[PDB]
Amino acid sequence: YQPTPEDRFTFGLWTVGWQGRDPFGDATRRALDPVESVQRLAELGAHGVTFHDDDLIPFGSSDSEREEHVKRFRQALDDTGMKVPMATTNLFTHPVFKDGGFTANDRDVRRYALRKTIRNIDLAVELGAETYVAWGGREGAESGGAKDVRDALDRMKEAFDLLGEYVTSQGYDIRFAIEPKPNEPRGDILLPTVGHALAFIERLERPELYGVNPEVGHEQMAGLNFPHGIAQALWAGKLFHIDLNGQNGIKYDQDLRFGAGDLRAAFWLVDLLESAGYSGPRHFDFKPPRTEDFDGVWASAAGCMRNYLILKERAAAFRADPEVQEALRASRLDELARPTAADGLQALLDDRSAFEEFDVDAAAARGMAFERLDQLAMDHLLGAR
Amino acid sequence: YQPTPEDRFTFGLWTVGWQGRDPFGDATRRALDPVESVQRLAELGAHGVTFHDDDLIPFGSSDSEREEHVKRFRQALDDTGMKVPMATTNLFTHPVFKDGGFTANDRDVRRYALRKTIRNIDLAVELGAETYVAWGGREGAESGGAKDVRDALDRMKEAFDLLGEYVTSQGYDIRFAIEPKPNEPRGDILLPTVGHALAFIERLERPELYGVNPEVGHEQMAGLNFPHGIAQALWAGKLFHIDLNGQNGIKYDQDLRFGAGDLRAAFWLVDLLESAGYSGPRHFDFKPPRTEDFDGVWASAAGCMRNYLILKERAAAFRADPEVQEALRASRLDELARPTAADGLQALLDDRSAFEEFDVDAAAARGMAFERLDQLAMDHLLGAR
Amino acid sequence: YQPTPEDRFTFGLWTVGWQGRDPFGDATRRALDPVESVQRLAELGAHGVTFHDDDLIPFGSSDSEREEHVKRFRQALDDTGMKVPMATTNLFTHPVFKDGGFTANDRDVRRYALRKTIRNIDLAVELGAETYVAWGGREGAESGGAKDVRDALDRMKEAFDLLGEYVTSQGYDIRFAIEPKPNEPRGDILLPTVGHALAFIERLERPELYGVNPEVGHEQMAGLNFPHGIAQALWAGKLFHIDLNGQNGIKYDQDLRFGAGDLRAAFWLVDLLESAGYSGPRHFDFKPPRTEDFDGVWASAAGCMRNYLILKERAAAFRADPEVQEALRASRLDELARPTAADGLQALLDDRSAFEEFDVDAAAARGMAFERLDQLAMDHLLGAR
Amino acid sequence: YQPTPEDRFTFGLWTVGWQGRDPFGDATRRALDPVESVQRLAELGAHGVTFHDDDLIPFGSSDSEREEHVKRFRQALDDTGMKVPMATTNLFTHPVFKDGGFTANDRDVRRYALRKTIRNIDLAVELGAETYVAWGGREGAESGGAKDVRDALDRMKEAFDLLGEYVTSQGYDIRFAIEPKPNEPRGDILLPTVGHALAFIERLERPELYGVNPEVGHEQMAGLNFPHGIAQALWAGKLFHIDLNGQNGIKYDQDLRFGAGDLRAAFWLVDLLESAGYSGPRHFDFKPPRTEDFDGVWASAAGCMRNYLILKERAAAFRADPEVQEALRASRLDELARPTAADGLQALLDDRSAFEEFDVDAAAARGMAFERLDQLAMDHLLGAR
Ligand SMILES: O=C(CO)[C@@H](O)[C@H](O)CO
Ligand SMILES: O=C(CO)[C@@H](O)[C@H](O)CO
Ligand SMILES: O=C(CO)[C@@H](O)[C@H](O)CO
Ligand SMILES: O=C(CO)[C@@H](O)[C@H](O)CO
Ligand SMILES: [Mn+2]
Ligand SMILES: [Mn+2]
Ligand SMILES: [Mn+2]
Ligand SMILES: [Mn+2]
Ligand SMILES: [Mn+2]
Ligand SMILES: [Mn+2]
Ligand SMILES: [Mn+2]
Ligand SMILES: [Mn+2]
């Protein structure tokens, strides 16, 4: 199950580059040069990398150092054929961001956040990114009086409307993807789930420029079904990008390699991405555990891609099995896809078979046959089929 | 802290009427006649009651029994001055609903669900309800292959579009409020949070007919900040109705009396409802614990209203305290309410004070003074102020 | 992967016999006669069944009806060769139990709970059970003032000490297994996890008569690692019995068939049970979803056993693979099993290589190689090995 | 509500000294000198401070620097009258600890962990500590094959037995308190709750030397009732020390000031500590949010003490109110405290009023009156009484 660049696997610089500093411990690994990560990921079969501004150009770099970091990076992409499909801004590490970027209470900080963002959109375009992610990890509060959330959503809409004005003014071909997270590092983060981010987008001045970048572990931090939230984002036409990883339930954001965590959810997510024909990058936002040395980093990144390809093969064998197609009909999945009342309202109202003569007891007695379908899915996942 | 009808407190018939049957135990209380609940709630100071169809007219009642249940009920409302501001449909108890109402896999059941719904909308209008709630507690799945969620959202949009066609065709003055819940009784429920329900509404044919009816305990079942989700529903103009209760964290849906559960969240929710001027019903969707007899039922319903009125007084004393107004300025809440860039994009781009000459270290060093503000809020809640 | 009676798979009568009544819905299946469940489970390859008193003899049965229910049951066990390795008492359904059995505030109810229990211990012995489970699902509270927990633990120790006096007085060969659950149906249940139940046992008059019956879904309702809690129960010598099922995270108690829920946890649990040589029953405490008819009931019960046998084969292939044995040495699992200081305290204190001359930087730089080990485990589980 | 040293309030050096580095951000505050924290806490009314070795003497300090840090510290305690009732070891920050201290897979690291521990026990004794805490935050795993937990509990018992040998050999008057935490920074931490730590202690060679140091936010990270776990630790005689703080549900470890988080749980915890007569330190293990400057640090530490004193006054007014004493009798709290069967087993067995003539329906019909009791508790907490 060997990845190639045609599988569209991507990685953040900050993922394999995570030094292992956690809330309770020092770094366990030395910093990697971005050039070295590009080379090593290209050897494992990835298609490309992504970056925050500050991963690529150290905070406070002069214009001359900037251009040098960029030139070196561009050389490694040329040398390897790696692409950069997505970029984002760090509006969370520097102390100035301690109360947020776009929704900081201090107006001066909010203007600074927008300026730092627009400078990186230009860079992203130059390097060919098609998607610009926004994770507002510092937007929110630990206490109720610290943040009026209606005012905060006004400031958040204002920031995103200004960015959509900027891109359209420049004539760039870049769309935005907002990434929800329910908590951590703030006590509560604004737009905490995919549903909250989708609903927010519909109030922007140009909603067609914005979609979501959901992350597996983030929706599971709220105990939600990740494949169900992705189906809603697909239904709305707003799955612009995705972050793949693993999480063991409701606790701190673990960012385990993809396939770790909830393995059945991983299976039904691949099933959905492949059957809806998602064609964006398969991006891993993960942290090799701090127990690992460099060898363990590259083994963890390789397992991300391996697990995706194994689950892809098992979900395709599941949907291709005639015995599964028969079970799906037995459970009336075909009937869920037909209109309830294509005949229209008046006809429904006049239909005695829908009410006055509907035999509720006979309908109630029909089993759904879901457990037999779910064991076929289990047998397929385990290769016991 | 005595409620009057002017406080707009309402209760479902199923709340004080809960017989105490749980997944592991039999009923501990006899059934109440709806007429008796109307009388007892009017004595405690409530403004009105709400109902599912099946709470008021027993499932399978003939037209003659129907009209009799309605006449008796109408007499008790006349006798007490109680109103009925909201009604909803039971699409969850009868076995026919075991796979959903509007998104059941069986198309016949979906048509039946719409017919049962429209019959109750007529009744609701006749009794004067202004809001019709929809809680799809059976819409969802315990396993991944049982429900294609894109098809299920197609069927859910189809159902709600047909209901909006019906109400507009009849010329009724009734709006719909969808109530999210993340799980229970299904393994995962579709539109599991306020954000998911808001985003869904924006894809209906006539979005202006639909809002949300969030419930305190339901968002806390996903570990989310209830006051933050209500602020987003207010920001979108979609807070049509609300269900008030208490929940102790992420576990089964407890439906404790309001003020039980997370008491600080209760305080910041009342603070928000009163400061945004929400004018809908203050409705309690709660279950007096099955340990209680009838005396304990009416004591629990009275505590719902008492706790709301105490929290209202403390939140108003908080916002009225000059020392709190000073702390809010100290924490720059005034600055969060001002536009970040009313000057426009070009001016922001030309402003050297926003970037090239912005002193990040001086801005970073400014404390937010949030803990002093939050202890003032604590002192106010406890009356230690 | 066909089960036989030698695999020691057992089922509660209440599991396949669950009629599908949930907090929001009516029964979707008719009641099964215990005789019919015995016959059907024996056909699928189970080894035996378990019962609460009230599953086998309807509450309030006269002595004559009692003896008749027992005789019929005994005939079906004779006809099939099924055993009864475990029995328990229903101290949760009847309204009298609304505040608990052994820790009800009313003393009369507590004495009644003990009498109902002892009557069923006699029956259990007669039918050959070796383990008597105690699940105190009504022991706990929805509010802080309702239960003094020190007094409640006094009453709980008193009840269990009286039962251990009874069994020793009668000379029965039966041990007790307490089953923890953190909540539901009470707001909080006493002894909410395996750790709490283990610690409690050590304060009983004869601790050797009591162990734990942990359930997969119950520890995961507190977000805990089920295999880690079982290793602690094994370490203490107190794994008397186990309840196998599946749960999707922190929410209501789902009781899905075994292998559903957290599939990797299922794998590491089988790995542990088989490698520590657990020889008790493999008992399924699960509920076929209420979407199912009778066909779906027996398919769900068969999948419990199938999934156990598949995971058993994959965990055995994992531990048998030379490449895995090499990885375990690479990650120093062999060193975890050696004493840290068999040399004794004084020698440790005099050892300069343990402190004064210990090279912390060289030790820190050694990678643990855990991600490579965990991908081997993944490949084994998926059959991609 | 002004604290004095007689209230026994203590703080870790690492609490007010937290620089605000989180998994996503840099420090927002400069480091404090321990001498300055001693002085500032003594001014706010605290009784004493606690320390990890590495908070007081920077890692890798020579013997001469060691003695200097100690002398300066001792001078500040002399100058202020502050005591040091508890000390602990840092076995979590340095990279060498990435797989644990006492249960690291590498045996050399385990011996190093014990040596670093024993050196700090000597210091703790010299400074007068009576309790030595052990928080094994690095003991556990992110993956199932990385840690055999039976071997890991063998190594953990071996470490604690060696420490109990050491203290008894030296004739020190110091006891150990193990602090549970369910996760973070490891995926799962061993002995994850108070129940797990209590049960473990009973397998040590000298159990009387060891108790628990439970933390409010840690049990709530597993969704458990903190006051119920403290009642069990009190019931076992093992509440040696306690860590007070606040947490908003199941998510990362927030360490908010005490009274933040779950305020009703805070009330019932103070009620319990004061009514059982706990006489150890009231220690705050909290982090002033990184939004704060130094002024906000000392305001947050003062609110910890203020909130404790307010809750103490409200819980004492609750238990002193004659109307509450009457409600407690109405809910049969007096009957929970009487033996169920002081008459003995034989008498219970011969008592027809316990079974054959027990009127279950009359007992079932008695209401518990818990909601009226719980609203009295609410009125008391809010000062509405
Ligand atoms: O998810 C996280 C942090 O939780 C980030 O890696 C975003 O994806 C990009 O800033
Ligand atoms: O919330 C619930 C069930 O959880 C219902 O009472 C809805 O409010 C109306 O059907
Ligand atoms: O676990 C449960 C209910 O949650 C019971 O089936 C016990 O196992 C036996 O009473
Ligand atoms: O609780 C924590 C970290 O979560 C520590 O402060 C311990 O109390 C002492 O090491
Ligand atoms: Mn993440
Ligand atoms: Mn991400
Ligand atoms: Mn509810
Ligand atoms: Mn509701
Ligand atoms: Mn269960
Ligand atoms: Mn069980
Ligand atoms: Mn903590
Ligand atoms: Mn602590």
Task: Report the alpha-carbon distance of residue C25 to residue A2 in Å, rounded.
Answer: 49
**Which residues of B participate in catalysis according to the annotation?**
52, 55
Contact indicator for B294, B16 with CB cutoff of 8 Å: no
Amino acid at the residue C267: F
Contact indicator for B221, B229 with CB cutoff of 8 Å: no
Cβ D183–A252 below 8 Å, yes or no?
Answer: yes
Measure Cα distances from A245 to A224, A308, C263, D33 in Å: 15, 10, 16, 41
For the record, the structure tokens of D46 come out as 């605290």
Q: Which of D26, D94, D184 sits opposite A94 (nearest CB)?
A: D26
Task: Report the alpha-carbon distance of residue C282 to residue C3 in Å, rounded.
Answer: 12
HSE-CB for D210 with a 13 A CA cutoff: 23
The number of the ligand 2 atom at minimal distance from the alpha carbon of B52 is: 10
**What are the DSSP calls for A346-381, one per residue?**
HHHHH-GGGTTT--HHHHHHS---HHHHHHHHHHHH
What's the CA angle centered on A199, arms A341 and A261, to 5 degrees?
95
Question: Cβ contacts (< 8 Å) between A253 and chain D: which residues?
Answer: 23, 252
Contacts of B63 (CB under 8 A, 6+ apart): none
Burial of B207 (0-12, 13-18, 19+ CB in 10 A): middle
DSSP three-state, residue B334: helix
CA D359 to the chain's CA centroid: 45
Largest pairwise CA distance in chain A: 80
Task: Give nearest CA residue, ligand 2 atom 6.
Answer: B285
Contact indicator for B142, A370 with CB cutoff of 8 Å: yes
Contact indicator for C1, C313 with CB cutoff of 8 Å: yes
C&D contacts, CB < 8 Å: 337
Amino acid at the residue B304: C
For the record, the structure tokens of B322 come out as 């000059």
**What are the DSSP calls for D90-139, one per residue?**
--SSSGGGTT-STT-SSHHHHHHHHHHHHHHHHHHHHTT-SEEEE--TT-
Task: Report the alpha-carbon distance of residue C80 to residue C84 in Å, rounded.
Answer: 12
> Nearest to residue C125, comparing CAs of C172, C70, C171?
C172
Query: Which positions 5-64 of A are in contact with B (Cβ < 8 Å)?
Result: none
Task: Report the alpha-carbon distance of residue D247 to residue A346 in Å, rounded.
Answer: 55
Domain count along chain B: 1
Task: Report the alpha-carbon distance of residue A355 to residue B111 in Å, rounded.
Answer: 8
Task: Give nearest CA residue, ligand 4 atom 7.
Answer: D135
Contact indicator for C97, C113 with CB cutoff of 8 Å: yes
Ligand 4 pocket test, candidate residues D49, D243, D244, D258, most atoms within 8 A of CB: D243
Beta carbons within 10 angstroms of residue A360's beta carbon: 18
How many residues does the structure list for chain C? 385
CATH number of the domain to which C268 belongs:
3.20.20.150
Task: Report the alpha-carbon distance of residue A128 to residue C169 in Å, rounded.
Answer: 82
The radius of gyration of chain D from alpha carbons, rounded to an integer in Å, stands at 23
Residues with CB under 6 A from ligand 4: D 52, 88, 133, 135, 137, 179, 181, 215, 243, 253, 285
Phi, psi of D69 (to 5 degrees): -65, -40
Task: Report the alpha-carbon distance of residue A52 to residue A55 in Å, rounded.
Answer: 5
> Is D366 part of the contact surface with chain B (CB cutoff 8 Å)?
yes
Question: Cβ contacts (< 8 Å) between B95 and chain C: which residues?
Answer: 20, 25-28, 290
Pairing relation of β-strands C188-189 and C140-141? antiparallel
The radius of gyration of chain B from alpha carbons, rounded to an integer in Å, stands at 23
| Cross-strand pairs, C211 | C177
To the question of whether residue A243 is assigned a binding role by annotation, the answer is: yes
Task: Give nearest CA residue, ligand 1 atom 7.
Answer: A135
Q: Which of B28, B98, B251 sits opposite C183 (nearest CB)?
A: B251
Q: H helices of chain C, where?
A: 13-16, 34-44, 53-56, 63-80, 107-126, 149-170, 194-201, 216-220, 226-235, 263-275, 294-320, 322-330, 333-336, 345-350, 360-365, 370-382
Contact indicator for B176, B134 with CB cutoff of 8 Å: yes
Measure Cα distances from D114 to C333, D118, D207 in Å: 20, 6, 19
Give the experimental resolution in Å. 1.7
Task: Report the alpha-carbon distance of residue C89 to residue C66 in Å, rounded.
Answer: 15
Question: Cβ contacts (< 8 Å) between A374 and chain C: which residues?
Answer: 260, 303
Question: Cβ contacts (< 8 Å) between C276 and chain D: which residues?
Answer: 150
Neighbours of ion ligand 9 (CB under 5 A): C 217, 253, 255
Contacts of C70 (CB under 8 A, 6+ apart): C56, C57, C123
CA B180 to the chain's CA centroid: 8
Contact indicator for A308, A258 with CB cutoff of 8 Å: yes
**D69 catalytic residue (yes or no):** no
Cβ B203–A147 below 8 Å, yes or no?
Answer: no
Amino acid at the residue B286: F
**Which sign does the torsion angle of CA D291, D293, D297, D300 carry?**
negative
Cβ C23–B289 below 8 Å, yes or no?
Answer: no
CA torsion angle for C184, C187, C193, C197 (degrees, to 10)? -100
Give the H or E element holding residue A71: helix A63-80
Asked whether the bond before C214 is cis by omega within 30 degrees of 0, the reply is no
Task: Report the alpha-carbon distance of residue D198 to residue A97 in Å, rounded.
Answer: 42
DSSP state, residue D190: S
Task: Report the alpha-carbon distance of residue D153 to residue D200 in Å, rounded.
Answer: 8
DSSP three-state, residue A142: coil
Task: Report the alpha-carbon distance of residue C376 to residue C89 in Å, rounded.
Answer: 44
Amino acid at the residue B141: A
Give the residue numbers spanning the domain of C195: 1-385
Catalytic hit among A53, A55, A262, A271: A55
Cα D293 to ligand 12 centroid, rounded to whole Å = 23
Task: Report the alpha-carbon distance of residue D291 to residue D293 in Å, rounded.
Answer: 7
Largest pairwise CA distance in chain D: 80
Task: Report the alpha-carbon distance of residue C198 to residue D207 in Å, rounded.
Answer: 15
Pairing relation of β-strands B243-244 and B282-284? parallel
For the record, the structure tokens of D210 come out as 């060891």
The radius of gyration of chain A from alpha carbons, rounded to an integer in Å, stands at 23
Largest pairwise CA distance in chain B: 80
Task: Report the alpha-carbon distance of residue B384 to residue B376 in Å, rounded.
Answer: 9
**What are the DSSP calls for B169-217, one per residue?**
HHT---EEEE---SSSSSSEESS-SHHHHHHHHTTSSSGGGEEE--BHH
Strand ranges for chain A from DSSP E: 9-12, 48-52, 83-88, 131-134, 140-141, 175-178, 188-189, 210-212, 243-244, 282-284
Amino acid at the residue D276: A
Measure Cα distances from D83 to B369, D15, D128 in Å: 30, 17, 8
For the record, the structure tokens of A107 come out as 């107006």
Catalytic hit among D52, D241, D283, D380: D52
To the question of whether residue D283 is assigned a binding role by annotation, the answer is: no
To the question of whether residue A151 is assigned a binding role by annotation, the answer is: no
Contacts of D148 (CB under 8 A, 6+ apart): C231, C333, C336, C337
Contact indicator for B214, B206 with CB cutoff of 8 Å: no
Cα C180 to ligand 10 centroid, rounded to whole Å = 9
Task: Report the alpha-carbon distance of residue B385 to residue D214 in Å, rounded.
Answer: 31
Beta carbons within 10 angstroms of residue D340's beta carbon: 25
Query: Shortest Cα distance from C106 to chain B (angstroms)?
Result: 12
Write the Ramachandran bin of B166: left for phi over 0, alpha for psi from -120 to 50, otherwise beta.
alpha
Question: Cβ contacts (< 8 Å) between B260 and chain D: which residues?
Answer: 264, 374, 378
Task: Report the alpha-carbon distance of residue B243 to residue A210 in Å, rounded.
Answer: 32
DSSP state, residue C83: E
Burial of B106 (0-12, 13-18, 19+ CB in 10 A): middle
Asked whether the bond before D185 is cis by omega within 30 degrees of 0, the reply is yes
Measure Cα distances from B253 to B222, B256, C251 in Å: 11, 9, 9
**What are the DSSP calls for C150-184, one per residue?**
HHHHHHHHHHHHHHHHHHHHHT---EEEE---SSS
> Is A94 part of the contact surface with chain B (CB cutoff 8 Å)?
yes
For the record, the structure tokens of C139 come out as 């022991």
Contacts of D342 (CB under 8 A, 6+ apart): none
DSSP three-state, residue A147: coil
Determine the residue of chain C that is closest to D161 in CA distance: C345
Contact indicator for D11, D284 with CB cutoff of 8 Å: yes
DSSP three-state, residue D40: helix
